[PDB]
Design a binder for this molecule. Structure first.
Ligand code: MAN
Ligand code: MAN
Ligand code: CA
Ligand code: CA
Ligand code: CA
Ligand code: CA
Ligand code: CA
Ligand code: CA
Ligand code: CA
Length: 313
């Protein structure tokens, strides 16, 4: 019939309730009337103090290991007055305290997101478990300020929380490849508890940058009697894409139908040099079309105007 209560994580010899008064006895008589505890299970976590006629704690008491998720933490014990032959039921409540903040299961999480991803996409975030329940349980999720994302606290009829990261501004690894965000799980206590997990956004690459030359039109003036193999020009095209998507290949547009090449444009480094003596060819003005190509078959087109200056006259 009796109901007591006691805070958790308390010490040994801590009062639970004035049992001598509710038992119809007197303090000194507690040892005299031969009343003891019938220790069945968790009832062993308590002991009787016959000196002051009280029920006291005799071991470590923590709701997390005893009750945890259950809203009421109750321990029902049976106390027997033998001489009177009377039995009594004692229900004991346990107060939850804040000694267990919301802790994540991972200290970090990497989210691989491609640039091509349009706003509206969503990627799951870690969750922190709260051993304590109530106000001393997980209360909020805070996300460090960014420009491309937003913390969506999803909640269904299930009851629990689902923190998902929503993209609302397109990413671009050609500008910024990685991002570092902070996921703070907070708890309402005194002071407010909290833990944090790291969120690394790894922006994967897509081939969206087409090759683009340094100049629409390349211009060079060289004497006809210049030695073959002379470095006329160093052609270059830009492609900020990652690795294979950034590999640029330079070549003449009409390279396939040509017979004897007058100039050699290197496939990789794009170095344009003299192949044959320009004097014998007797050409005074060249206007050649060149192109640059990546593995995505994206083209860049440019021109090169070679003015050949005659010597002997
Ligand atoms: C998480 O947030 C709390 C405030 O809610 C801090 O007290 C704690 O140190 C951690 O930064
Ligand atoms: C949680 O987040 C904080 C940033 O507020 C980190 O400094 C900490 O190491 C933990 O990952
Ligand atoms: Ca506790
Ligand atoms: Ca607790
Ligand atoms: Ca807590
Ligand atoms: Ca891009
Ligand atoms: Ca790219
Ligand atoms: Ca490219
Ligand atoms: Ca000549």
């Amino acid at each position: 019939q009796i109901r007591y209560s006691v805070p958790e994580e308390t010490d040994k010899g801590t009062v639970v309730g004035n049992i001598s008064k509710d038992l119809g006895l007197e303090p000194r008589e507690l040892a005299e009337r031969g009343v003891r505890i019938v220790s069945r299970g968790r009832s062993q976590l308590f002991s009787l103090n016959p000196r002051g006629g009280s029920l006291v704690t005799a071991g470590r008491i923590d709701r997390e290991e005893l009750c945890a998720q259950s809203t009421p933490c109750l321990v029902n014990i049976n106390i027997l007055v033998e001489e009177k032959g009377k039995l009594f039921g004692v229900e004991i409540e346990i107060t939850d305290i804040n000694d267990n903040n919301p802790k994540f299961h991972v200290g970090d999480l990497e989210v691989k997101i491609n640039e091509i991803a349009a706003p509206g996409a969503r990627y799951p975030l870690p969750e922190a478990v709260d051993p304590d329940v109530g106000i001393n349980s997980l209360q909020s999720y805070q996300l460090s300020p960014n420009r491309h994302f937003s913390l969506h606290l999803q909640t269904g009829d299930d009851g629990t929380i689902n923190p998902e990261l929503v993209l609302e501004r397109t990413l671009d690894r050609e500008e910024e490849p990685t991002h570092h965000l902070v996921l703070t799980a907070s708890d309402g206590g005194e002071p407010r508890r909290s833990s944090t997990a790291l969120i690394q956004i790894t922006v994967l690459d897509t081939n969206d940058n087409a090759p683009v030359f340094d100049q629409p039109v390349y211009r060079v003036k060289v004497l006809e009697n210049v030695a073959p193999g002379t470095l006329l020009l160093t052609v270059r095209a830009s492609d900020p894409d990652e690795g294979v998507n950034g590999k640029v290949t330079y070549k003449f547009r009409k390279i396939n139908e040509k017979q004897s090449l007058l100039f050699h444009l290197h496939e990789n480094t794009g170095e344009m040099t003299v192949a044959k003596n320009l004097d014998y060819e007797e050409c005074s003005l060249y206007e050649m079309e060149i192109q640059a190509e990546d593995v995505g078959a994206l083209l860049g087109r440019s021109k090169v105007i070679i003015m050949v200056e005659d010597v002997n006259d």
